[PDB]
């Protein structure tokens, strides 16, 4: 359909396949295929349990991958349950994904900065860290070893900086792995995103089954304070008569503007007001033949 919709669908499919397990992928692909889904429809499609979908819905709601709609409807049997509708807010979802990956790369840069700090020291007995600044204030009179404040034990060296390049390697091993994500957001930032909602998502849903208990029609409430074309093929012989018909209308236009008979002439002298060629043409046709032979549930309705 819309190519930008395809790009955001592939982006949402990619982020769940990488950083999330298989059940999360199944839930998000169910929502991306059938754009409007309820709890019963999701359970029927996935054959999933109520307790099984708990952590999955919690994690996709915590990352704003799935938005929830709390609309309740009125089925004919009046045994209505407050069904939740799972859908996707496309600009909210892509903004959440962008913010999450930006915070991840910022945290990785901060971890690289922390590992770029020197090794420091750690006491194996009391399990306490000591920076290189406070190690020098704790060295012995022999100027040979750094002694602990409490245990009075020689400090062993940590590895802050030995694995720092490894973090950079981890940085590298993230970036190509996040390369299809950033390339997708280029076309997203260069194009316009239509902000969808529950009413917008109802224009592109896919029916999960024939008999769905959840009704997709929106029910508004009062008090909540949160043309046709026709052508005429004419043989140009009747059309002249049609002009004559227009002449008839013109004659009517002469009657509408006609001066009344009492206005055009004086009414004084009148009394006061008070209480056969067909056989001939057949013979010509026979003569034509002779000459040719010789020479050769009910509601309101509106008609639209």
């Amino acid at each position: 359909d819309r190519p930008i919709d395809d790009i955001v669908k592939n982006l949402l499919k990619f982020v769940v396949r990488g950083f999330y397990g298989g059940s999360f992928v199944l839930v998000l692909d169910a929502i991306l295929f059938h754009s409007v889904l309820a709890e019963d429809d999701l359970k029927q499609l996935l054959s999933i349990n109520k307790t099984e979908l708990g952590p999955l819905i919690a994690r996709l709601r915590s990352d704003r991958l799935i938005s929830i709609h709390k609309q309740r409807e009125y089925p004919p049997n009046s045994k209505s349950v407050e069904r939740v509708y799972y859908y996707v807010k496309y600009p909210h979802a892509i903004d959440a994904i962008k913010w999450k990956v930006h915070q991840v790369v910022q945290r990785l840069k901060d971890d690289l900065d922390k590992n770029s700090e020197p090794n420091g020291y750690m006491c194996p007995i009391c399990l306490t860290k000591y920076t290189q600044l406070e190690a020098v204030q704790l060295l012995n009179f022999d100027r040979t070893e750094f002694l602990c404040s409490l245990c009075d034990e020689p400090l062993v060296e940590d590895d802050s900086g030995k694995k720092n390049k490894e973090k950079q390697d981890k940085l590298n091993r993230l970036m190509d792995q996040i390369q299809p994500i950033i390339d997708s957001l280029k076309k997203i930032d260069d194009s316009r995103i239509e902000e969808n909602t529950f009413e917008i998502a109802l224009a592109r849903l896919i029916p999960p089954q024939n008999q769905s208990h959840a009704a997709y029609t929106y029910n508004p409430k009062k008090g909540s304070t949160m043309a046709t074309l026709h052508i005429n093929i004419t043989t140009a012989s009747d059309e002249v008569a049609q002009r004559e018909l227009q002449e008839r209308q013109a004659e009517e236009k002469r009657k509408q503007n006609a001066v009344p008979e009492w206005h055009k002439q004086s009414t004084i002298g009148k009394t006061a007001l008070g209480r056969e060629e067909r056989e001939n043409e057949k013979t010509l046709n026979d003569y034509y033949a002779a000459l040719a032979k010789k020479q050769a549930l009910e509601d309101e309705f509106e008609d639209v």
């Binding site: 224009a203 997709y216 029609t217 549930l297 509601d299 309101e300 309705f301 509106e302 008609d303 639209v304």
Partner: protein, 34 residues
């Protein structure tokens, strides 16, 4: 063709045939589709 207005709740399209005339029922869910 009998069609339902947007003010009504149920969307349904009635078809009338010619020669007993045949009548068909076509109900829909979305107003743009109608």
């Amino acid at each position: 063709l009998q069609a339902t207005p947007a003010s009504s709740e149920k969307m349904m399209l009635r078809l009338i045939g010619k020669v007993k005339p045949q009548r068909h029922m076509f109900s829909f869910n979305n107003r743009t589709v109608m």
